[PDB]
Design an enzyme around this catalytic site. Structure first.
Site, PDB file in Angstrom:
ATOM      1  N   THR F   1     101.644  44.661 -21.312  1.00  0.00           N
ATOM      2  CA  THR F   1     101.070  45.717 -20.418  1.00  0.00           C
ATOM      3  C   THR F   1     102.148  46.075 -19.391  1.00  0.00           C
ATOM      4  O   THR F   1     102.587  45.220 -18.649  1.00  0.00           O
ATOM      5  CB  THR F   1      99.867  45.113 -19.713  1.00  0.00           C
ATOM      6  OG1 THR F   1      98.931  44.649 -20.710  1.00  0.00           O
ATOM      7  CG2 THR F   1      99.186  46.065 -18.722  1.00  0.00           C
ATOM      8  N   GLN F   2     102.504  47.330 -19.313  1.00  0.00           N
ATOM      9  CA  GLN F   2     103.284  47.858 -18.177  1.00  0.00           C
ATOM     10  C   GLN F   2     102.362  48.265 -16.965  1.00  0.00           C
ATOM     11  O   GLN F   2     102.654  48.001 -15.787  1.00  0.00           O
ATOM     12  CB  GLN F   2     104.083  49.061 -18.692  1.00  0.00           C
ATOM     13  CG  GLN F   2     105.180  48.795 -19.752  1.00  0.00           C
ATOM     14  CD  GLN F   2     106.090  47.583 -19.426  1.00  0.00           C
ATOM     15  OE1 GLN F   2     106.544  47.380 -18.250  1.00  0.00           O
ATOM     16  NE2 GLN F   2     106.312  46.710 -20.467  1.00  0.00           N
ATOM     17  N   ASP F  59      94.096  42.263 -21.695  1.00  0.00           N
ATOM     18  CA  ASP F  59      95.065  41.198 -21.883  1.00  0.00           C
ATOM     19  C   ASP F  59      94.365  39.874 -21.859  1.00  0.00           C
ATOM     20  O   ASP F  59      94.751  38.960 -22.639  1.00  0.00           O
ATOM     21  CB  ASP F  59      96.230  41.162 -20.878  1.00  0.00           C
ATOM     22  CG  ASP F  59      97.210  42.281 -21.076  1.00  0.00           C
ATOM     23  OD1 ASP F  59      97.267  42.896 -22.204  1.00  0.00           O
ATOM     24  OD2 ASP F  59      97.961  42.602 -20.041  1.00  0.00           O
ATOM     25  N   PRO F 105     104.759  41.857 -19.961  1.00  0.00           N
ATOM     26  CA  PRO F 105     103.903  40.754 -19.544  1.00  0.00           C
ATOM     27  C   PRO F 105     102.481  40.924 -19.998  1.00  0.00           C
ATOM     28  O   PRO F 105     102.056  42.014 -20.419  1.00  0.00           O
ATOM     29  CB  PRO F 105     103.956  40.834 -18.046  1.00  0.00           C
ATOM     30  CG  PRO F 105     104.206  42.358 -17.781  1.00  0.00           C
ATOM     31  CD  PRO F 105     105.230  42.699 -18.805  1.00  0.00           C
TER      32      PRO F 105
ATOM     33  N   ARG H  91      98.687  50.266 -26.631  1.00  0.00           N
ATOM     34  CA  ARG H  91      98.093  50.749 -25.354  1.00  0.00           C
ATOM     35  C   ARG H  91      99.250  51.516 -24.596  1.00  0.00           C
ATOM     36  O   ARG H  91      98.954  52.424 -23.892  1.00  0.00           O
ATOM     37  CB  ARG H  91      97.577  49.610 -24.466  1.00  0.00           C
ATOM     38  CG  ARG H  91      98.593  48.556 -24.157  1.00  0.00           C
ATOM     39  CD  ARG H  91      98.022  47.398 -23.429  1.00  0.00           C
ATOM     40  NE  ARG H  91      97.432  47.873 -22.181  1.00  0.00           N
ATOM     41  CZ  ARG H  91      96.673  47.177 -21.364  1.00  0.00           C
ATOM     42  NH1 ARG H  91      96.456  45.870 -21.600  1.00  0.00           N
ATOM     43  NH2 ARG H  91      96.186  47.768 -20.223  1.00  0.00           N
TER      44      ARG H  91
END
Ligand code: 6V7
Ligand code: 6V7
Ligand code: CL
Ligand code: CL
Ligand code: CL
Ligand code: CL
Ligand code: CL
Ligand code: CL
Ligand code: CL
Ligand code: CL
Ligand code: CL
Ligand code: CL
Ligand code: CL
Ligand code: CL
Ligand code: CL
Ligand code: CL
Ligand code: CL
Ligand code: K
Ligand code: K
Ligand code: K
Ligand code: MG
Ligand code: MG
Ligand code: MG
Lengths: 213, 196, 123, 234, 239, 216, 200, 202, 233
Positions: F1-2, F59, F105, H91
């Site tokens: 995930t950014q 996440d 991350p 995503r």
């Protein structure tokens, strides 16, 4: 911009004696303006003869110490003997440099006995530069501790003083004093001081309380 | 900063280059040589970014010498110029571009003397005379003013000297000495350095 | 790609492909070398004569570099491959050492090329 | 015959000759014995010496603090497998910060050593191991074979004349669980000594010993360090 | 000769290398499965080749998912590799589709993997047959058996290994559709004792597992006390 | 995930004599929007171990999938060995570090509680691989609002009973509801002891608004 | 840092300061900036501490391998070239290294400047590092190919000293080496404070 | 966009507006945002038209193949899981706020949200897209446990109508679908058939 | 014809056994380990007076503290020797210490069975190495001699011979060797044994000898130093 690093504080210190090495650190682990925990030492036993102090980004301190542990066993399996203090130092230099383009954010100081049973200290930058030293401070309060060690252990800037051998007792007094001084002024250093004394007989541990603010 | 010049006469090509290697505010070498012998009758003069310049010129040089060894005769100044070009151009859009500017001087048995100009983009132009570097800005018009196609080698060295004197007078960089070589039917000849 | 093991040991420690390669060399034209005091000389047989042949095109003595040459006996197509490999290597050496190769250096390079083709799959 | 050169060729009896031939490499190695009590796992090995002036081949190898092995068969295969084991152990300490359970390591060996038995141009591993370990389920002795099968053992012997050692171990195995360490190692030595020609004896030059247990990391005893264990076979 | 590769048909259209692999399963000691009213029970005649081996060594009964048991015969290293393939397939199915793999689909998938090793000179067929058993409220009891050619069918009762036929004939006597798992374990133990040749192979362990309403759809070892009773029943029934 | 999308706020944990308790509200926020108001941010990992997560909920669901599958894989072996709380905390530290080291991350901060072999385990891991143990933990705003209260009690009395730890957690959850604008007054409490892992909820705290009439 | 070297009739003089810094913090006063590549070859370090140490250690490895494979000493030219070819591949990735490769081989005294920008050049004298400008002034006013041995020692020592005085990033001690035809020797180590006393 | 779905005893109701925009140009005023993924499973799409079309076609392929293999109708939970896997994995490259709803014989009517980022949660009813913001308070006040199919349809049509009036990126017609064991019934509310609520004049 | 990784019914790899037979086609080499150092000695086996003797090199330096004598198919030894050299230098690079004789030998021995024709890279090793090696050196365990053969088996030996006459030479070694023997004695002993076993008359150009001692680095004996030792023998 995700940042892969954060600063977690911590001060480290090592002193080489004739027949001993001290490695010391505080036990505070910080982030931003907070304390994660008051009981997180920065020293790690590597062999009966070698201790390493690590401060900086804790995620890297954990990873790197786990890498070093694995490599010591790999060495021992392939060469049928424990790594020396000097060989651990040299190896650490290459492991740090392997991440030259994404460094381990860790300041490392090794303290131990060399192959003649004498105290040895090796100090590192995060990308693996290093040398042997008689003593060294590292991490958060290093600029506060170093000058005093220069003066009191190195006898720098002093006239009319006998350059005597450093006794364990005086080295101990110095270590406790400088961390206490550091706890006064560095916000990251506090809670407790953990001291490891490496001699021929093994590694023993002292702990001293520091201010909790 | 680096100056290369060439002047082609009827049956020779004269070339010269400064002898400085600089770094930040200092000259670190005053007897630097920017010429690479490719073959008996071919010089490649190369300037530009550090590392790229030697790595590029030596790669060309080795391959031209390899060509001699495989085939028993040498690549013509024109072939070598186009070989050089193909390499530079093929690298331009790669992960390993070479930031170099060149002159290629040679003498062919059948074609006679040749001088080629190449920039880092790998544009190749054959010319009667040419120059590279900031110093070119002050000397090309001296060449335009006095060059003629039949210029003798004695007057070419005089013409060259006018160019080099103009740098001493007018250019802000301290380039006090120059390598000078000529190529003709009998190969590559070292002339005296021109010095101030 | 073709990975068959071609050179293998037989009972008693023979490498038959290598022995057979040596038989090829024995049917080649004779070549001779003598090391002088300040000269070296190579001579080689024949091979067939033939008036209609262009002499230039079938020499068996070859420059590898300015200071090193070689003659061969055996399969002439194979030789041409070795010769060209060695000529490439002489230029790498000059490139990275700025000396011409020693004769021993390039010999050792050729020899180790030949050895590798006795212990690599598919060849 | 037409059925014995490829590990991928089944015979008409449902056998794979290459695997059986690989097992012969273990039967011709020098004997080793492994046994355990409630608290310790022990390995004992006879070392063969090429000449009178040679050291004697290592038979016992360290894998991790809680695991050691004794080998029989192709030494090069033994090292490759040992290196695999070592790496699997380091990985589990790196990932989970705890020792790799011995039965899981053995499963990994079975899975790894099975693969080349089923692909053309590959061959079995020509080594058999005795594995001594200690974890939360106590001491263990496992055996692995070139067939990629493995076994959980009260005790075991493999190698030349191991049948003798196996008999001895069956004869006395009801005593092993309750044995103190010294008794247990004595038993291992007596089993091993059965494998020898009548003339010849256990000496400090030919015996190697490996021990792991509750309070003891895997440790190797060679040369002068085996003498305590050999004195008082009385 | 026509029997050296799985990529060569004989002139009669057979693949002998698959048949040879089948012979390795037929040399093995016997495993059986029985599907009943409320689940599936497995039993294996597990020959003990040395008294030096621990109880439980060389299991032939595996959990391949929480709801799926596997019983094998044949070359044990091949079976174990297949148990890993089945595990990986059940795991991947759960990751991709978000629920427990249906038994039939698992059986068909691992069967296609077995099948892929019967086409090529590059690899050899697996020397094992295996049964897969499960139970759920939605799907009921299911028992599948796969062989070295990759054929997969569903069964009421099944046996593999060397006393296969003798075992089947005993299984046919049971009205298993109306029996519970608790009843069937005894009958499984009974049948293994019947087909065991006590003259020719001297010592064996009975291995038992089940999956059904009584284990809430989990595949589990039969508890020790229940196994011992089933053994005692089997032994006295032999009389 | 950014870029985190639906996120959870603080997770609390404290050791007590015989176990560990963790607490987490049931909200997934989408920026300021209190979007999914009945999601569990706590996972029973196995009998000895539980996990709670702040940060990106997708996440977290990925971690749950991965970790749940690992525990099933291990149980299949039926071999007498289980992942201890400490092993799972180790695994999780490596997984976050490794994802951080690829610049991708998993956007979470986690609290692992467990009970095994007579010892309470409580450990933290963040998206960068920072991990440690302590007698009490609190992620997000809890580090500022709850941790001071946990530590103050613990310094007077390091050993708490289960009921004391539960009451102390309830007081912290109230403070969070007062002062964290991404909290929600619907939470779970998970407890691990000798007996296993119990998740209770949905739970609410009493609140007092008398100060609303103390302005003049 | 300040490092210098020069060729002269009697070999090559090599000298360095001993300071390291992290920004303005003085990290060490006892760095060894002259590396013993083999008994006839020295390398000097200026720039990133880890970069210089690593790449010069790697150069020492490679020179040693070379010597084993070829059964003769590597030339200064070839050694310096190995180093340039190693670092060329990293241009633009932020390595910082400036080194002098100093030896004596079949061409006589040898001195090459090699850096992480890709330069490789032979020359009579060089100075490298943040103090180099200051060392060049003094070295250049005193240098001669026919310097006597002890005069050459004096010059090198004084040039590094003067650099330590002006350049905040140079200091500690001056370490001096002499490459002779049969090997380098370590000639002296003088603390800059003791030199200060002496030169006034 | 505004998308919604609601569970009832025996099935689900789905709805959407029909506006596709590029900036503030309406590139389609009668978009069909409710896409059949299998005989009794639909997805409501919001976000990028290109992304949600590509993902829906992909999941339709995966689900169809899976269903043939198993020889049974697929679970709604499976369809949602497959969207989740693809929306979570990608995503960083997708802009997709999805609602999956349908009927299967094992669990009946179900609604799942897979919002941006790729989490998945089952709900009694779900709303999404840019216009959903304007109907949180309305759906939270108006939702009742135990609504009939017909009530779900009216509840959906009203919510969507309210969102459409306020959200510049929603509008056009209201497409509705009801899914149950018996099949799929679709309809369009246009013009005067859209529920109407007065502008509050003085 | 069968594959290179085929086992015999005795449990040996055919290719390895045949490689072991190729060692017998080599010249005889001898190693002896004493408390004062190790010596290595090798028969050159000159086939023409026109050949340059100094171009036969069957004893090579690995590092300053380790030498290596080879017998068998010499061309095969090159990649092994290079591997030993690279490894010791890697170890120095990484650990700033010399690598033990045992460790070097181990590293080289791990290449031994790495051959085969359908696991590996497009043209990897097709067969084992036809070579045996004696590694002689000094490390912190003291002086040390290790032997390795094409099976990848390696072991420490107080004294060992390899190549054509190794039976023979090994018997004489058992006869003359003793634990307290001096290095000078060991040197003489191995030259006496070579002299017996060699087809040609021993002299100072058709043999090579090297030593490594706790004091002193790898040293190849010069013509003149060999002549001196040859006088008594
Ligand atoms: B000289 O060039 O001024 C000297 C050369 C020598 C080889 C030490 N160079 C330096 O002092 C350089 N310093 C460092 O590289 C250095 C010293 C201490 C810490 C760190 C560090 C590196 C990475 C991350 C944090 C800290 N670098 C030069 C002055 O920078
Ligand atoms: B809804 O979320 O507002 C609606 C749902 C969609 C139909 C599934 N989305 C849109 O209208 C979006 N529009 C587009 O994705 C779209 C359609 C046609 C062209 C383009 C376009 C994209 C980039 C550059 C040029 C044109 N986008 C809208 C909200 O972005
Ligand atoms: Cl090649
Ligand atoms: Cl053996
Ligand atoms: Cl072997
Ligand atoms: Cl077996
Ligand atoms: Cl055996
Ligand atoms: Cl069967
Ligand atoms: Cl919700
Ligand atoms: Cl849960
Ligand atoms: Cl110094
Ligand atoms: Cl080299
Ligand atoms: Cl130069
Ligand atoms: Cl969304
Ligand atoms: Cl949405
Ligand atoms: Cl519209
Ligand atoms: Cl031999
Ligand atoms: K402080
Ligand atoms: K659309
Ligand atoms: K609108
Ligand atoms: Mg404070
Ligand atoms: Mg570039
Ligand atoms: Mg896109």
């Amino acid at each position: 911009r995700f940042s892969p690093y954060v600063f977690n504080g911590g001060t480290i210190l090592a002193i080489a004696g004739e027949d001993f090495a001290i490695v010391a650190s505080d036990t505070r682990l910080s982030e931003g303006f907070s304390i994660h925990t008051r009981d997180s030492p920065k020293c790690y036993k590597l062999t009966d003869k070698t201790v390493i102090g690590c401060s900086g980004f804790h995620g890297d301190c954990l990873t790197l110490t786990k890498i070093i542990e694995a490599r010591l066993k790999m060495y021992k399996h392939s060469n049928n003997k424990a790594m020396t203090t000097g060989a651990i130092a040299a190896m650490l230099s290459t492991i740090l440099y392997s991440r030259r383009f994404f460094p381990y954010y860790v300041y490392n100081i090794i303290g131990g006995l060399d192959e003649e049973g004498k105290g040895a200290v090796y100090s590192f930058d995060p990308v693996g530069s290093y040398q042997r030293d008689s003593f060294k401070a590292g991490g958060s309060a290093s600029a506060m501790l170093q000058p005093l060690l220069d003066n009191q252990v190195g006898f720098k800037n002093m006239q009319n003083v006998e350059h005597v051998p450093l006794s364990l007792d005086r080295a101990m007094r110095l270590v406790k004093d400088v961390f206490i001084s550091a706890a006064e002024r560095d916000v990251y250093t506090g809670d407790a001081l953990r001291i490891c004394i490496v001699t021929k007989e093994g590694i023993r541990e002292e702990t001293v309380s520091l201010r909790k603010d | 900063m680096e100056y290369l010049i060439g002047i082609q006469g009827p049956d020779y090509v004269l070339v010269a280059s400064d002898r400085v290697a600089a770094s930040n505010i200092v000259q670190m070498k005053d007897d630097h040589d920017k010429m690479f012998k490719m073959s008996e009758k071919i010089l490649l003069l190369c300037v530009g970014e550090a590392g790229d310049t030697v790595q590029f010129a030596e790669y060309i040089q080795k391959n031209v010498q390899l060509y001699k060894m495989r085939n028993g005769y040498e690549l013509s100044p024109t072939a070598a110029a186009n070989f050089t070009r193909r390499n530079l151009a093929d690298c331009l859009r790669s992960r390993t571009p070479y930031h170099v500017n060149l002159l290629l001087a040679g003498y062919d048995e059948h074609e006679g003397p040749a001088l080629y100009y190449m920039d880092y983009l790998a544009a190749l132009a054959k010319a009667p005379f040419a120059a590279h570097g900031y110093g070119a800005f002050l000397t090309l018009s001296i060449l335009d003013r006095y060059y003629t196609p039949t210029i003798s080698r004695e007057r070419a060295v005089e013409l060259l000297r006018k160019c080099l004197e103009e740098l001493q007078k007018r250019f802000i960089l301290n380039l006090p000495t120059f390598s000078v070589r000529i190529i003709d039917k009998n190969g590559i000849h070292d002339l005296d350095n021109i010095s101030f | 790609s073709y990975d068959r093991a071609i050179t293998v040991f037989s009972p008693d420690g023979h490498l038959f492909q290598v022995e057979y390669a040596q038989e090829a060399v024995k049917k080649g034209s004779t070549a001779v070398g003598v090391r002088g005091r300040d000269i070296v000389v190579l001579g080689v047989e024949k091979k067939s004569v033939a008036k209609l042949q262009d002499e230039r095109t079938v020499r068996k003595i070859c420059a590898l570099d300015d200071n090193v040459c070689m003659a061969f006996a055996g399969l002439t197509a194979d030789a041409r491959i070795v010769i060209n490999r060695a000529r490439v290597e002489c230029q790498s050496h000059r490139l990275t050492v700025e000396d011409p190769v020693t004769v021993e250096y390039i010999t050792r390079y050729i020899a180790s090329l030949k050895q590798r083709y006795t212990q690599s799959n598919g060849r | 015959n037409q059925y014995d050169n490829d590990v991928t060729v089944w015979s008409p009896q449902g056998r794979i000759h290459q695997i059986e031939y690989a097992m012969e490499a273990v039967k011709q190695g020098s004997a080793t014995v492994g046994l355990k009590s409630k608290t310790h796992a022990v390995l004992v090995a006879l070392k063969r010496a090429q000449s009178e002036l040679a050291a004697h081949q290592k038979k016992i190898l360290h894998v991790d603090n809680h695991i050691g092995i004794s080998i029989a068969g192709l030494t090069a295969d033994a090292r490759l497998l040992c290196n695999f084991m070592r790496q699997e152990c380091l990985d589990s300490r790196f990932v989970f910060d705890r020792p790799l359970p011995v039965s899981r390591l053995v499963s990994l060996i079975g899975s790894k050593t099975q693969i080349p038995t089923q692909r053309y141009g590959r061959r079995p591993y020509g080594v058999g191991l005795l594995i001594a370990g200690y974890d939360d389920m106590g001491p263990h002795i496992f055996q692995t074979c070139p067939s990629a099968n493995y076994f959980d053992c009260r005790a075991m012997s493999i190698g030349a004349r191991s049948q003798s050692a196996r008999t001895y171990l069956e004869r006395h195995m009801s005593e092993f669980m309750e044995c103190n360490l010294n008794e247990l190692v004595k038993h291992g030595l007596r089993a091993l000594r059965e494998t020898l020609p009548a003339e010849q004896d256990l000496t400090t030059k030919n015996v190697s010993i490996g021990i792991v247990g509750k309070d003891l990391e895997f440790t190797i005893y060679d040369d002068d360090d085996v003498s305590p264990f050999l004195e008082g076979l009385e | 000769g026509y029997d050296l590769s799985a990529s060569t048909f004989s002139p009669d259209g057979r693949v002998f290398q698959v048949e040879y692999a089948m012979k390795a399963v037929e040399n093995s000691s016997t495993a059986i499965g029985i599907r009943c009213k409320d689940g599936v029970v497995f039993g294996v005649e597990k020959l003990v080749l040395s008294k030096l081996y621990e109880e439980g060594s060389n299991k032939r009964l595996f959990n391949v998912d929480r709801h799926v048991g596997m019983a094998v015969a044949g070359l044990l290293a091949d079976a174990r590799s297949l148990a890993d393939i089945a595990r990986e397939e059940a795991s991947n199915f759960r990751s991709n589709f978000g629920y427990n793999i249906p038994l039939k689909h698992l059986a068909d998938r691992v069967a296609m993997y077995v099948h892929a090793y019967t086409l090529y000179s590059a690899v050899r067929p697996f020397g094992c047959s295996f049964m897969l058993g499960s139970y759920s409220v939605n799907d009921g009891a299911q028992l599948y058996m796969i062989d070295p050619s990759g054929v997969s069918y569903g069964y009421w009762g099944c046996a593999i290994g060397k006393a296969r036929q003798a075992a089947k004939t005993e299984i046919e006597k049971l009205q298993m559709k109306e029996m519970t798992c608790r009843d069937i374990v005894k009958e499984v133990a009974k049948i293994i004792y019947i087909v065991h040749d006590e003259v020719k192979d001297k010592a064996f362990e009975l291995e038992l597992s089940w999956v059904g309403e009584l284990t809430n759809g989990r595949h589990e070892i039969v508890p020790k006390d229940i196994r011992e009773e089933a053994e005692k029943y089997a032994k006295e029934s032999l009389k | 995930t950014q870029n985190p999308m639906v996120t959870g706020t603080s997770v609390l944990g404290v050791k007590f004599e015989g176990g560990v308790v963790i607490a987490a509200d049931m909200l997934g926020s989408y920026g300021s929007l209190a979007r999914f108001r009945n999601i569990s941010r706590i996972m029973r990992v196995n009998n000895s171990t539980m996990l709670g997560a702040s940060g990106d909920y997708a996440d977290f669901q990925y971690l749950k999938q991965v970790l749940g599958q690992m525990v099933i894989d291990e149980e299949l072996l039926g071999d007498g060995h289980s992942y201890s709380p400490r092993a799972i905390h180790s695994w999780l530290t490596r997984a976050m570090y490794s994802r951080r080291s690829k610049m991708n991350p998993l956007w979470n901060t986690m609290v692992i509680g467990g009970y095994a072999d007579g010892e309470s385990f409580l450990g933290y891991v963040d998206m960068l691989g920072v991990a440690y143990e302590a007698p009490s933990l609190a992620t997000g705003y809890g580090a500022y609002l709850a941790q001071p209260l946990l530590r103050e009690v613990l310094e007077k009395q390091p050993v708490l009973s289960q009921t004391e730890a539960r009451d102390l957690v309830e007081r912290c959850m109230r403070v969070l509801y007062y002062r964290d604008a991404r909290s929600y007054n619907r939470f779970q409490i998970a407890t691990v002891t000798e007996k296993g892992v119990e998740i209770e909820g949905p739970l609410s705290t009493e609140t007092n608004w008398d100060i609303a009439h103390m302005i003049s | 840092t300040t490092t210098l070297a020069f060729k002269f009739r009697h070999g090559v003089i090599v000298a360095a300061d001993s300071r390291a810094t992290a920004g303005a913090y003085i990290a060490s006063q006892t760095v060894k900036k002259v590396i013993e590549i083999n008994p006839y070859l020295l390398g000097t370090m200026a720039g990133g501490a880890a970069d210089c140490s690593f790449w010069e250690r790697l150069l020492a490895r490679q020179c040693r391998i070379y010597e084993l494979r070829n059964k003769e000493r590597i030339s200064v030219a070839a050694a310096s070239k190995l180093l340039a070819n190693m670092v060329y591949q990293y241009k633009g990735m932020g390595l910082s290294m400036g080194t002098m490769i100093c030896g004596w081989d079949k061409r006589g005294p040898g001195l090459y400047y090699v850096d992480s920008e890709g330069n490789r050049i032979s020359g009579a004298t060089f100075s490298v590092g943040s103090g180099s400008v200051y060392a060049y002034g003094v070295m250049d006013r005193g240098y001669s190919y026919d310097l006597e041995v002890e005069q050459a020692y004096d010059l090198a020592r004084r040039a590094i000293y003067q650099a330590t005085y002006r350049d905040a990033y140079s200091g500690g001690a001056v370490n001096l080496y002499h490459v002779r035809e049969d090997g380098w020797i370590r000639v002296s180590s003088d603390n800059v404070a003791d030199l200060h006393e002496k030169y006034s | 966009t505004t998308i919604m779905a609601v569970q009832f005893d025996g099935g689900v109701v789905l709805g959407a507006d029909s506006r596709t925009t590029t900036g503030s140009y309406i590139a389609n005023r009668v978009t069909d945002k409710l896409t059949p993924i299998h005989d009794r499973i639909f997805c409501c799409r919001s976000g990028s038209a290109a992304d949600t079309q590509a993902v829906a076609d992909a999941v339709t392929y995966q689900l169809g193949f899976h269903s043939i293999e198993l020889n049974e109708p697929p679970l709604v939970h499976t369809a949602a899981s497959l969207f989740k896997e693809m929306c979570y994995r990608y995503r960083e490259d997708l802009m997709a706020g999805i609602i999956i709803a349908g009927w299967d014989p094992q669990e009946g009517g179900q609604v799942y949200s897979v919002p941006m980022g790729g989490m998945m949660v089952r709900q009694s009813f779900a709303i999404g897209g840019s216009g959903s913001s304007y109907i949180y308070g309305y759906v939270d006040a108006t939702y009742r446990e135990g609504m009939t199919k017909e009530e779900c349809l009216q509840f959906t049509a009203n919510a969507l109508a309210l969102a459409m009036e306020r959200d510049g990126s929603s509008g056009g017609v209201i497409r509705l679908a009801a899914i149950a064991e018996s099949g799929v019934e679709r309809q369009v509310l246009l013009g005067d058939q859209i529920p109407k609520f007065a502008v509050a004049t003085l | 014809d069968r594959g290179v990784n085929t086992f015999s019914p005795e449990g040996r790899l055919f290719q390895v056994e045949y490689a072991i037979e190729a060692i017998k086609l080599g010249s005889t080499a001898i190693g002896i380990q004493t408390s004062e150092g190790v010596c290595l000695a090798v028969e050159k086996r000159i086939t023409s007076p026109l050949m340059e003797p100094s171009s036969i090199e069957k004893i090579v330096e690995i590092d300053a503290h380790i030498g290596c004598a080879m017998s068998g198919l010499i061309a095969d030894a090159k990649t092994l020797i290079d591997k030993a050299r690279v490894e010791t230098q890697n170890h120095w690079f990484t650990y700033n210490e010399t690598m033990t004789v045992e460790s070097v030998t181990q590293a080289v021995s791990n290449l031994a069975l790495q051959f085969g024709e359908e696991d590996a890279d497009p043209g990897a090793m097709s067969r084992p190495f036809g070579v045996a090696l004696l590694f002689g050196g000094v490390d912190e365990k003291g002086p040390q001699l290790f032997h390795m053969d094409p099976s990848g088996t390696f072991v420490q030996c107080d004294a060992r011979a390899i190549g054509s006459a190794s039976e023979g030479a090994q018997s004489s070694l058992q006869e003359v060797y003793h634990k307290s023997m001096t290095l000078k004695e060991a040197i003489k002993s191995s030259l006496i044994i070579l002299k017996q076993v060699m087809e040609e008359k021993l002299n100072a150009t058709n043999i090579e000898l090297a030593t490594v001692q706790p004091g002193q680095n790898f040293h190849m004996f010069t013509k003149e130093e060999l002549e001196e030792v040859i006088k008594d023998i």
